[PDB]
Amino acid sequence: VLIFHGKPVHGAIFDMDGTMFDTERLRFQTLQQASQELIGQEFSHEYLMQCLGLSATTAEKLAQRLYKEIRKRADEMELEHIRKHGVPIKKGLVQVLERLRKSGLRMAVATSSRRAIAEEYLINANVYKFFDVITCGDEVEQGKPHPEIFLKAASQLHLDANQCLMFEDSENGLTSAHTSKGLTILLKDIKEPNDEMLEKAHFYYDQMYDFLTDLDQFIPVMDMPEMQEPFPQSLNQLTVGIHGFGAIGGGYIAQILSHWDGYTKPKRIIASTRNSLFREAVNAFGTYSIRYGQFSYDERIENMSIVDSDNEQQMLEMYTHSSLIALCLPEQAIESESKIIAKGLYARFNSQEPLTFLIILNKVGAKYLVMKHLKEALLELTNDEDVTEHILKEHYFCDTVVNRMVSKLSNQNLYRQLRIKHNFLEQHLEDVEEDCNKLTPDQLNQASIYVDNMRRNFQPGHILQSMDLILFHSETDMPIYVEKGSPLLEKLRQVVLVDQITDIQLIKNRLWNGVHAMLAWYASLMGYESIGVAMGDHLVKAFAENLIAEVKQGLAIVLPNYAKDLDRMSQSFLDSCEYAFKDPCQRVARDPLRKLNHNERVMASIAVNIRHDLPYKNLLKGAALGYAYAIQFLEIEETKAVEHLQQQIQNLDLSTAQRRQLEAELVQLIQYLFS
Amino acid sequence: VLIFHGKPVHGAIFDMDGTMFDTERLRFQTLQQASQELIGQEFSHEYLMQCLGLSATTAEKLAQRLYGVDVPYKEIRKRADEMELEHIRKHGVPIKKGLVQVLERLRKSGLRMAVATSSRRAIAEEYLINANVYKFFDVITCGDEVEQGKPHPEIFLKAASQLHLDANQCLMFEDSENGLTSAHTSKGLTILLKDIKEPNDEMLEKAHFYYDQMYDFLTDLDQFIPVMDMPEMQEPFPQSLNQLTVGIHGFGAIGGGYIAQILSHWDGYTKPKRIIASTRNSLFREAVNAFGTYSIRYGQFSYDERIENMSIVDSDNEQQMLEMYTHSSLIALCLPEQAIESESKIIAKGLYARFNSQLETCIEPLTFLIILNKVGAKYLVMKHLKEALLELTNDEDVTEHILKEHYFCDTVVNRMVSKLSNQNLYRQLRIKHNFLEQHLEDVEQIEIEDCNKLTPDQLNQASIYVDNMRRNFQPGHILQSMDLILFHSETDMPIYVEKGSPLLEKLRQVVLVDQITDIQLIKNRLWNGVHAMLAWYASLMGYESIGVAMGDHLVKAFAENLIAEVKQGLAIVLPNYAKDLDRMSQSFLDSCEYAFKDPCQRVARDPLRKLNHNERVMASIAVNIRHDLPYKNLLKGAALGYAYAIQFLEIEETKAVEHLQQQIQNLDLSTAQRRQLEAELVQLIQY
Ligand SMILES: NC(=O)C1=CN([C@@H]2O[C@H](COP(=O)(O)OP(=O)(O)OC[C@H]3O[C@@H](n4cnc5c(N)ncnc54)[C@H](OP(=O)(O)O)[C@@H]3O)[C@@H](O)[C@H]2O)C=CC1
Ligand SMILES: NC(=O)C1=CN([C@@H]2O[C@H](COP(=O)(O)OP(=O)(O)OC[C@H]3O[C@@H](n4cnc5c(N)ncnc54)[C@H](OP(=O)(O)O)[C@@H]3O)[C@@H](O)[C@H]2O)C=CC1
Ligand SMILES: O=C(CO)[C@@H](O)[C@H](O)[C@H](O)COP(=O)(O)O
Ligand SMILES: [Cl-]
Ligand SMILES: [Cl-]
Ligand SMILES: [Cl-]
Ligand SMILES: [Cl-]
Numbered sequence A: 001v002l003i004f005h006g007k008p009v010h011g012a013i014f015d016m017d018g019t020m021f022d023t024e025r026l027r028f029q030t031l032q033q034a035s036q037e038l039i040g041q042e043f044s045h046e047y048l049m050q051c052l053g054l055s056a057t058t059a060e061k062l063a064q065r066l067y068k069e070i071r072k073r074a075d076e077m078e079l080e081h082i083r084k085h086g087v088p089i090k091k092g093l094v095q096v097l098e099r100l101r102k103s104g105l106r107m108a109v110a111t112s113s114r115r116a117i118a119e120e121y122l123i124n125a126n127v128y129k130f131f132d133v134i135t136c137g138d139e140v141e142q143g144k145p146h147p148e149i150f151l152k153a154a155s156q157l158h159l160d161a162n163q164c165l166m167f168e169d170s171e172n173g174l175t176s177a178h179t180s181k182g183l184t185i186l187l188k189d190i191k192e193p194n195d196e197m198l199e200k201a202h203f204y205y206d207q208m209y210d211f212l213t214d215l216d217q218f219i220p221v222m223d224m225p226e227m228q229e230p231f232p233q234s235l236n237q238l239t240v241g242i243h244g245f246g247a248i249g250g251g252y253i254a255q256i257l258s259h260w261d262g263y264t265k266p267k268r269i270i271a272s273t274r275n276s277l278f279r280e281a282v283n284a285f286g287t288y289s290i291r292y293g294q295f296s297y298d299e300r301i302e303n304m305s306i307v308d309s310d311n312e313q314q315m316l317e318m319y320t321h322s323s324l325i326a327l328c329l330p331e332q333a334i335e336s337e338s339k340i341i342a343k344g345l346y347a348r349f350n351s352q353e354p355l356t357f358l359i360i361l362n363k364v365g366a367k368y369l370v371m372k373h374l375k376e377a378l379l380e381l382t383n384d385e386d387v388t389e390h391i392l393k394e395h396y397f398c399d400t401v402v403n404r405m406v407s408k409l410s411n412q413n414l415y416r417q418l419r420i421k422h423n424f425l426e427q428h429l430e431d432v433e434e435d436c437n438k439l440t441p442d443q444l445n446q447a448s449i450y451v452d453n454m455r456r457n458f459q460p461g462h463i464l465q466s467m468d469l470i471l472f473h474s475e476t477d478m479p480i481y482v483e484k485g486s487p488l489l490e491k492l493r494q495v496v497l498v499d500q501i502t503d504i505q506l507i508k509n510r511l512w513n514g515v516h517a518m519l520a521w522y523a524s525l526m527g528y529e530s531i532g533v534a535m536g537d538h539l540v541k542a543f544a545e546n547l548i549a550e551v552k553q554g555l556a557i558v559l560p561n562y563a564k565d566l567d568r569m570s571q572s573f574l575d576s577c578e579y580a581f582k583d584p585c586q587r588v589a590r591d592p593l594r595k596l597n598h599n600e601r602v603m604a605s606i607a608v609n610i611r612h613d614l615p616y617k618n619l620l621k622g623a624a625l626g627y628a629y630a631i632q633f634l635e636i637e638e639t640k641a642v643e644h645l646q647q648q649i650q651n652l653d654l655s656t657a658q659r660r661q662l663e664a665e666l667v668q669l670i671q672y673l674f675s
Numbered sequence B: 001v002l003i004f005h006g007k008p009v010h011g012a013i014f015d016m017d018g019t020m021f022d023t024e025r026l027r028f029q030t031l032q033q034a035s036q037e038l039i040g041q042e043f044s045h046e047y048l049m050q051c052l053g054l055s056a057t058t059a060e061k062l063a064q065r066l067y068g069v070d071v072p073y074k075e076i077r078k079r080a081d082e083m084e085l086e087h088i089r090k091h092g093v094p095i096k097k098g099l100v101q102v103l104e105r106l107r108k109s110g111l112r113m114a115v116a117t118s119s120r121r122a123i124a125e126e127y128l129i130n131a132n133v134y135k136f137f138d139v140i141t142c143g144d145e146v147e148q149g150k151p152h153p154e155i156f157l158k159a160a161s162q163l164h165l166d167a168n169q170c171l172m173f174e175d176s177e178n179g180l181t182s183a184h185t186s187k188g189l190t191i192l193l194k195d196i197k198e199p200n201d202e203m204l205e206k207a208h209f210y211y212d213q214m215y216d217f218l219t220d221l222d223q224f225i226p227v228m229d230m231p232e233m234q235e236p237f238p239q240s241l242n243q244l245t246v247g248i249h250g251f252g253a254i255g256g257g258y259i260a261q262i263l264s265h266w267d268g269y270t271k272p273k274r275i276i277a278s279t280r281n282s283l284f285r286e287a288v289n290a291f292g293t294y295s296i297r298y299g300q301f302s303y304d305e306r307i308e309n310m311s312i313v314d315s316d317n318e319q320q321m322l323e324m325y326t327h328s329s330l331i332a333l334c335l336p337e338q339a340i341e342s343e344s345k346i347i348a349k350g351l352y353a354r355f356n357s358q359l360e361t362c363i364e365p366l367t368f369l370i371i372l373n374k375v376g377a378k379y380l381v382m383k384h385l386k387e388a389l390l391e392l393t394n395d396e397d398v399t400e401h402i403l404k405e406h407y408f409c410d411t412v413v414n415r416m417v418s419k420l421s422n423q424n425l426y427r428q429l430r431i432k433h434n435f436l437e438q439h440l441e442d443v444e445q446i447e448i449e450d451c452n453k454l455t456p457d458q459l460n461q462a463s464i465y466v467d468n469m470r471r472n473f474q475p476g477h478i479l480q481s482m483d484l485i486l487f488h489s490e491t492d493m494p495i496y497v498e499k500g501s502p503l504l505e506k507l508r509q510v511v512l513v514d515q516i517t518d519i520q521l522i523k524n525r526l527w528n529g530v531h532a533m534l535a536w537y538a539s540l541m542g543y544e545s546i547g548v549a550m551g552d553h554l555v556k557a558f559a560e561n562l563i564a565e566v567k568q569g570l571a572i573v574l575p576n577y578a579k580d581l582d583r584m585s586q587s588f589l590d591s592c593e594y595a596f597k598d599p600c601q602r603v604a605r606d607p608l609r610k611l612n613h614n615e616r617v618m619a620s621i622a623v624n625i626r627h628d629l630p631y632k633n634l635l636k637g638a639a640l641g642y643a644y645a646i647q648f649l650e651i652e653e654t655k656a657v658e659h660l661q662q663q664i665q666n667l668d669l670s671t672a673q674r675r676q677l678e679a680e681l682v683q684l685i686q687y
């Protein structure tokens, strides 16, 4: 029992032609072209405008005052257009229908078109499942604008008309809906609403999507998804983007966008990568799976279009058509990719709803860096300060905090997977090598041809029922934390809106990412290649716990308001580390020098503890292990490591006495590790 | 924390070859095949059985003693290794029966799991990926990554330490002597599994638990892991497949639109790898086989439930129908009463073929579910089955053996389902074929770039794989968001089945009962009784369908008030089914709402038989009278029955009055209460 603007709704009856689908425009074209062939000259435009929401029987009566053979030819032309291009579905239909269905409303269709035509489009559009009963032009005795068709629809749902919502495009159908004494809703299609029409209608909207927005405030927002909870079955017409198909982009964001609002799912998810093996593998399979090792669960992500990042046309296609885009690149990529972001947003402006831009980046002040490089890139191309400041203030640029640890598969391990699975496909192909069922011989013979070439195309792909494409190892952490602003994010299930995200990003940097990097450097040098296995060692676990203690003690002084929550945050981190067996130390230890910057997850904590006279013994060891890892494993040269060490210690907000002691204590500890 | 024989288990460490995979028997075969090629004669079974446990050097020296010093053993062994990889890579690694069922139980129990293999990382990983069991393991400790191998405990001690566990917190699975010593010495709970050779007395002394095979450990493990709850609507099926086949004799409305869901859910840990379904409908058969799957539509929630791993066969084809009764662990008979007599011959030939079969699946007894909405349904099947077996075999001993070997289970189903028409299927096949053509116009409209940590030889070979994969898979990309809808079913989940078969004990969508009598009586009075009484009220008020009749507020009011009066009675008679009555009551009212397909006549057939003293209508009236409860709607229902008989069926009023008088006298009521009921009933009929 839905309450739409303080009115109790039990059902929802829809018109098909012009309200659900844009087939009313096509009938205009076909009836004109059909009239030309039969009776030489086209029909009057006023005749067609008066034959909106009228049955072929009712429309025939008007024609005689000025048809069956013309309409038959026009219907044949109309069908052929639908058989090629598909049913032109009004944007927001599938999104509306699902919300009304899950609200528990008894839904139906009341269309002037006959059952043979009505069911053909409803099945093609794939919206026939949403309706309990349908009323056609054949079923009704007295057609529109008589309310019989809408009364019969309400009666078959076992409800009264006044309890049911009624959608319509035409003036005749609106009268048919209004005279029935139901909650009429008018949607503009191919006629400017009259004073007569706008008075009858209880509610009016310019598009179907305008009603969806109004309805959505009465529809409940769904809660955080559970791990193995299915995605929505029904697809909307919205596209979404993933600027960087890597660990977090493919192994987390793709799940968030796949869950969406829980009513509908994006039609297409466009993901960008220069890794050709990953690109060609996904596009070949048609899907890829995220592996959750904890529960040995493979999560199949579908409707994925993997494109080249260098390919300009495909990247512009993302930024023009996508409702929401997620930037999933590291610091190094921000400067170069900002030019492709700028070119995409300028193409969106040149084209005819505001974009929601998620920034996934492990850095304090991540948005400042992205927005700085974007403005510089835009100004260089646009050469106009008026168009740039508009674009920057038009779209929602959102800071995020992602706690989920995700690992990308190596190209050797992806090749190993493809090699093993290709052998099964080859063997499957070697294994691969109607009577009379109350149908006509013509239908039976036609059915045989359909099933034969359907088997021919599908049968090789039967192996995909069991066979998955594993590209990502991810932990089971669901909720993503994002800034307030974007109205879209309010309705997304997996998104949790926060206020002071800067404070959370700081704790995330120092307490999580910092301890993660330092214990990974300690684990790497001890010979461990797995974070999960490394945390099994008493020394590695003790080191991480000692670091956590030193970091939290400093964060408590800088953020006393967050001091209360530090224990559960530090514990939540260790829990995620303890059994991270598939997460390699390599990817956690990557870019040591970047992480050893003066305002980053290591040196920033050391500085805080020095100022407030707090113990930083273990923090200093982690820094030494950072430079030790860089010189030994990555081979950067010692002279570079010192030039970095000396420069960052110079930038630290400390006294000259504290600067030289830190440099002396650190450089001595680095030499101690080597000899 | 899994409790196994009074010991807390936090981990499980498995040996690979001989424990998880049947690779020792494959190495047995390849050695014989390789010998036949080179030296001309096969290495004897007896020699190979003797070589089990011994080193390659000892095995070579033994071969030299038997087949001569110049026997090319190293060449035969190298060839045998090539034949092994060739077979494993194309046909798949042979997995021990029950392994995936065990691994899923240990994983969902929250155990941290590892592999302790003497094999090398490279070949060990490929095998685990090939089998698709790598997903279940956190770490893998290999023979080429330890100083001292088995029987030294290092490999099991290391595997345990990498899982953050002491050895004595882990179950350790092994087949070989040296491996068991390694596992035992480390201090783990040893599980010894017999592979090929009978283990010596010293191995049986060391082992904490011994099993003849994996499935014997699975049977033991089942005692310590729970049977899962009744599945909810839109709840996913298990991802992992077991090695069992199941049958649905009659791919009809209830067979394909309900039983398929129960078998797909299975125990919640795994599901059958194949579901064989029989039908004479060629369109249904070829269509499902072409898609490789079909979907069940649940109108209420607009949810399409995709049934995977289906194989539709011809009911006339013996070789296909015998393959069902030979390979299936559980079969569901989903036929009408009329087809029982004719199909009994195919069942007899099926069960007789199973008796004569020399395969391993046939050794285990069959679980036979009788899906039929008739009292004494099983005893109609068993009667016709006995007749058909005697007719076939002409051996009274073999006939009686087969009848007592297998489990024949009576059932009660509450889900209403309708199968799609061939007219509507052709309509769907035409529109779905249209989308395939549209999809195939886009595919026609490979590039692997610079060395991404790959050699140029394995860059070229990668391009061949993805190109070959794309050419075959791309046409079937449409199947992602495209369903072959063949059934429209209601949301009623639980199937009631007679307790007995051990195979039913873990099936999560099954409700086991010692006697079916109780729930079959509820089905009769609460469901079938109201359905008949409602159908009589609909027909007399000129409604072709129940679904349309519910549009009349009088009809829907009658139904809701009638189920209330019956429920009140059954609550006193069967207070142990209180929850089942409340559930079935609402499940019926939901089904009736939009029951457009099934007509009123079918359900309203034989009113006089259904108005008997011990039947769905009059029995409920008597129960309510004995316990002083309202029976005004049941009384109206009884009147509508005799009214329908006189109007539609054209029965004489004299016969109708003669009937109820005999029935009322048979009811256990007071002499006064008998005369009270008779007077009120005849009044409503004449109206
Ligand atoms: N995965 C995790 O554990 C978490 C990650 N994050 C943060 O999210 C972001 C995601 O990085 P992640 O995905 O983890 O690591 P990845 O290396 O997987 O980054 C993936 C994307 O970055 C692109 N990329 C990498 N280097 C460059 C470059 N030099 N120029 C252009 N594009 C480049 C890759 O392109 P190609 O595909 O061509 O390699 C890929 O598309 C990082 O900032 C990370 O810190 C936050 C918390 C969790
Ligand atoms: N759906 C329901 O309403 C419920 C069903 N049941 C019981 O389940 C049983 C089957 O229901 P349903 O599946 O709807 O019946 P269907 O007729 O829809 O399908 C029955 C199956 O039996 C086969 N079959 C039918 N008649 C014959 C015959 N004369 N000779 C040989 N084979 C035959 C059909 O073969 P083909 O496939 O070639 O037609 C089909 O596979 C019935 O007894 C019903 O009472 C129980 C309660 C609820
Ligand atoms: O953020 C998380 C999740 O807790 C980590 O998985 C980091 O991704 C890792 O510490 C490497 O950090 P970066 O190299 O990606 O900055
Ligand atoms: Cl939409
Ligand atoms: Cl390791
Ligand atoms: Cl570096
Ligand atoms: Cl199995």
Ligand SMILES: [Cl-]
Pocket: B117, B118, B142, B143, B148, B149, B150, B155
């Ligand atoms: Cl070993």
Ligand SMILES: [Cl-]
Pocket: B372, B373, B374, B411, B412, B413, B414
């Ligand atoms: Cl039944």
Ligand SMILES: [Cl-]
Pocket: B372, B373, B374, B375, B411, B412, B520, B523
């Ligand atoms: Cl029954």
Ligand SMILES: [K+]
Pocket: B218, B219, B222, B503, B506
């Ligand atoms: K079992």
Ligand SMILES: [Mg+2]
Pocket: A015, A016, A017, A018, A019, A052, A053, A054, A169, A170, A173
């Ligand atoms: Mg219209």
Ligand SMILES: [Mg+2]
Pocket: B015, B016, B017, B018, B019, B175, B176, B179
């Ligand atoms: Mg072994």
